[PDB]
Design an enzyme around this catalytic site. Sequence first.
Site, PDB file in Angstrom:
ATOM      1  N   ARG A 150       8.876  16.892 -19.568  1.00  0.00           N
ATOM      2  CA  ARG A 150      10.060  16.597 -20.360  1.00  0.00           C
ATOM      3  C   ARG A 150      11.316  17.175 -19.713  1.00  0.00           C
ATOM      4  O   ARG A 150      12.426  16.728 -20.003  1.00  0.00           O
ATOM      5  CB  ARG A 150       9.917  17.177 -21.773  1.00  0.00           C
ATOM      6  CG  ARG A 150       9.747  18.681 -21.789  1.00  0.00           C
ATOM      7  CD  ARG A 150       9.730  19.251 -23.199  1.00  0.00           C
ATOM      8  NE  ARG A 150       9.327  20.655 -23.172  1.00  0.00           N
ATOM      9  CZ  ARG A 150       8.064  21.069 -23.116  1.00  0.00           C
ATOM     10  NH1 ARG A 150       7.074  20.190 -23.096  1.00  0.00           N
ATOM     11  NH2 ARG A 150       7.785  22.362 -23.047  1.00  0.00           N
ATOM     12  N   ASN A 151      11.141  18.171 -18.848  1.00  0.00           N
ATOM     13  CA  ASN A 151      12.277  18.807 -18.183  1.00  0.00           C
ATOM     14  C   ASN A 151      12.467  18.368 -16.734  1.00  0.00           C
ATOM     15  O   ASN A 151      13.125  19.047 -15.944  1.00  0.00           O
ATOM     16  CB  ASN A 151      12.161  20.339 -18.257  1.00  0.00           C
ATOM     17  CG  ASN A 151      12.720  20.903 -19.554  1.00  0.00           C
ATOM     18  OD1 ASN A 151      13.694  20.380 -20.093  1.00  0.00           O
ATOM     19  ND2 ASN A 151      12.125  21.984 -20.047  1.00  0.00           N
TER      20      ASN A 151
END
Length: 299
Positions: A150-151
Amino acid sequence: PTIYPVLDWNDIKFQDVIGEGNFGQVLKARIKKDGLRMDAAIKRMKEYRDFAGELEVLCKLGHHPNIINLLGACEHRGYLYLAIEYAPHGNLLDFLRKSRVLETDPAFAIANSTASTLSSQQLLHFAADVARGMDYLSQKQFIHRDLAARNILVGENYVAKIADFGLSRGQEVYVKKLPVRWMAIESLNYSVYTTNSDVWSYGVLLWEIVSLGGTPYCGMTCAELYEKLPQGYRLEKPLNCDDEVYDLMRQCWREKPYERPSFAQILVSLNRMLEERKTYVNTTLYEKFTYAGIDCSAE
């Protein structure tokens, strides 16, 4: 604390609001740089310290293809408008999940005997991209603390870029209190973070890439993890994963922090697999293929 180049407010055109990893919500925009109009995203930072702290870290980032680069900044009405690279393809988790063509478009999938629009080579290149970017960052004392799909953003030409807002810098950092499913045993126990613990998180991220966006420990609760992980429990090998890729994962989760490989060693391992014609992360249907679960009740 000044981030260059200095951008002029009237050269900035806002177009939308979007998310960009740990930068949180940012403004999709168009700015002027080197005489040309280009796409970018803008992170608005209130200057009213906590601000001076995260700005000093941002200035130590430098430049690297596998991180989100700073493009300039504009001071306006008490807020600092930080321009950063725009990722046309969004975050990696979403990108991985949108590639599960057997669910999004089964006809294409069956017709092409494939479980993903992404090939084994492309998946490993994503892993290599993050490892290359983390080698660059850790070498400069950065400690990410929240390394996960997600990052990671999929940028121009599909180059994976690490979201780098609010990172730590130093030998070790203690953060009271959560991404429990990516946290190393020492972090779960004492809330401490190091590049060694970032390597543990990277292992889970590699697991995410391999499983095409599956939820780590899908089914187990956070409470169960605090109990079982210290006992030796580890994520199981995805069904489409080659033994060598899994062993790389296992190295990243060794109990002794100092026994985990460095990001540079991880990149060497990844590059060796990429050089061979052999398939390491299977995406071909054959006679059976299983998609890793996605427990949205844990997200």
